[PDB]
């Protein structure tokens with residue numbers, strides 16, 4: 001099941017400011033465990049570092065980006081996340097949020 | 109029902125050259141088959157292409173994983189368009205990496 005978070009890139013290090021109900025269910029984390037943190041806590045031992053750097057660069061480009069990256073639930077179970085990030089702008093054109101949608105595509 | 113611009117590259121050859129190009133690629137980008145075959149697809153890039161998007165692709169390829177990025181590209185005639193570029197690895201029946209496929213999708217004219 002699919003889920004989504006918003007980060008605030010005007011704060012240092014893109015803390016999560018919104019997390020959909022399904023994110024808590026699918027990952028096992030509580031609201032208090034997620035809000036205010038950077039979403040990289042979903043990565044783990046087998047997460048490919050080149051995909052991590054690819055996400056970092058896509059954010060610096062402020063552009064829509066999708067990548068298949070291995071993530072982990074609170075219980076340690078692993079899943080391929082088809083992660084879809086997109087920028088969200090205010091009416092004046094300023095970057096306001098990143099939205100990032102987690103899509104489990106297979107188990108690991 | 110839209111046309112499907114796509115290229116396949118050979119990562120067993122230096123710099124991931126194009127080894128196949130769909131008919132729609134030639135129509136959409138303005139390049140001829142002879143201008144394209146055997147070259148890396150970065151020739152679609154130009155002056156206002158974002159370098160971080162370029163590096164995100166380079167990393168996505170190193171990760172050997174499906175990924176997609178919106179990146180500004182240029183046709184042969186110099187017109188600029190945002191390309192929603194969808195790249196995936198292609199495996200042989202034994203599961204070994206064989207090709208990369210990269211589909212071009214104009215989503216905005218500059």
Ligand SMILES: Cc1cc2nc3c(=O)[nH]c(=O)nc-3n(C[C@H](O)[C@H](O)[C@H](O)COP(=O)(O)O)c2cc1C
Nearest residue numbers: 005006007038039040042052055056098099100102
């Ligand atoms: C809105 C948003 C959602 C994100 N979701 C995930 C995610 O679900 N899984 C993941 O591995 N990384 C996710 N990231 C990426 C990390 O937060 C971070 O940008 C990435 O690890 C690269 O930065 P780093 O090298 O400093 O870790 C997300 C980023 C943003 C902005």
Ligand SMILES: Cc1cc2nc3c(=O)[nH]c(=O)nc-3n(C[C@H](O)[C@H](O)[C@H](O)COP(=O)(O)O)c2cc1C
Nearest residue numbers: 115117148149150152153162165166208209210212
């Ligand atoms: C199969 C395939 C298709 C590609 N299609 C494009 C494209 O349509 N437009 C683009 O700007 N880059 C495209 N690329 C990316 C570039 O070829 C190159 O990988 C990227 O610029 C990062 O490499 P670099 O830093 O060495 O240039 C494609 C790559 C592959 C493997």
